[PDB]
């Protein structure tokens, strides 16, 4: 097939930027992700593509719990910090304050506008990633605002 065309077409996909978190005891993990989409209205399902060989994939697969926060249009700088390994210091992750989520107590970045807690229902491995399908069990809105669209950041993950 035309691999160059394939890369371009896949790179033409539009994505939002989110931060997914997970934890097991004192071990916590957070990372910026873009392969995300709702997958059902009833029940409320979301699908997140996580790299099989990654810290967050290991925690999410093993504990079956996760939290996801939507980054605001002006939070590129924050999204930037969660590309690196997660370093927890006090009630902060990579320099950003967080609070325990209301349901399972997963790390919640208090600066981000929207957040949700979800339980893993199915984890579908496929190639180098796995499609985690989880059911939203709680959600919260600190404030309303336009989300961060990946294209505007200049970054990308696809192709």
UniProtKB/TrEMBL annotation:
<comment type="similarity">
    <text>Belongs to the non-flavoprotein flavin reductase family.</text>
</comment>
<dbReference type="Pfam" id="PF01613">
    <property type="entry name" value="Flavin_Reduct"/>
</dbReference>
<dbReference type="InterPro" id="IPR002563">
    <property type="entry name" value="Flavin_Rdtase-like_dom"/>
</dbReference>
<keyword id="KW-0503">Monooxygenase</keyword>
<keyword id="KW-0560">Oxidoreductase</keyword>
<protein>
    <submittedName>
        <fullName>Probable nitrilotriacetate monooxygenase component B</fullName>
        <ecNumber>1.14.13.-</ecNumber>
    </submittedName>
</protein>
<dbReference type="GO" id="GO:0042602">
    <property type="term" value="F:riboflavin reductase (NADPH) activity"/>
</dbReference>
<dbReference type="InterPro" id="IPR050268">
    <property type="entry name" value="NADH-dep_flavin_reductase"/>
</dbReference>
<dbReference type="GO" id="GO:0004497">
    <property type="term" value="F:monooxygenase activity"/>
</dbReference>
<feature type="domain" description="Flavin reductase like">
    <location>
        <begin position="10"/>
        <end position="157"/>
    </location>
</feature>
<dbReference type="InterPro" id="IPR012349">
    <property type="entry name" value="Split_barrel_FMN-bd"/>
</dbReference>
<dbReference type="GO" id="GO:0010181">
    <property type="term" value="F:FMN binding"/>
</dbReference>
């Amino acid at each position: 097939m035309n691999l160059e065309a394939k890369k371009k077409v896949l790179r033409s996909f539009t994505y939002g930027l989110y931060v997914l978190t997970a934890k097991d005891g004192d071990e916590v993990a957070a990372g910026t992700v873009n392969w995300v989409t709702q997958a059902s209205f009833q029940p409320p399902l979301v699908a997140v593509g996580l790299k099989r060989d990654s810290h967050l994939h290991a925690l999410v697969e093993r504990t079956g719990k996760l939290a996801l926060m939507t980054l605001a249009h002006d939070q590129k700088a924050i999204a930037q910090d969660f590309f690196k390994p997660t370093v927890r210091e006090g009630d902060r992750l990579n320099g950003h304050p967080f609070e325990p989520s209301p349901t399972f107590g997963l790390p919640l970045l208090t600066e981000l506008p929207y957040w949700l807690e979800a339980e893993v229902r199915h984890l579908y491995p496929g190639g180098d990633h796995s499609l985690v399908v989880a059911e939203v069990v709680e959600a919260g809105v600190r404030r309303e605002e336009k989300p961060l669209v990946m294209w505007d950041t200049g970054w990308f993950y696809g192709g």
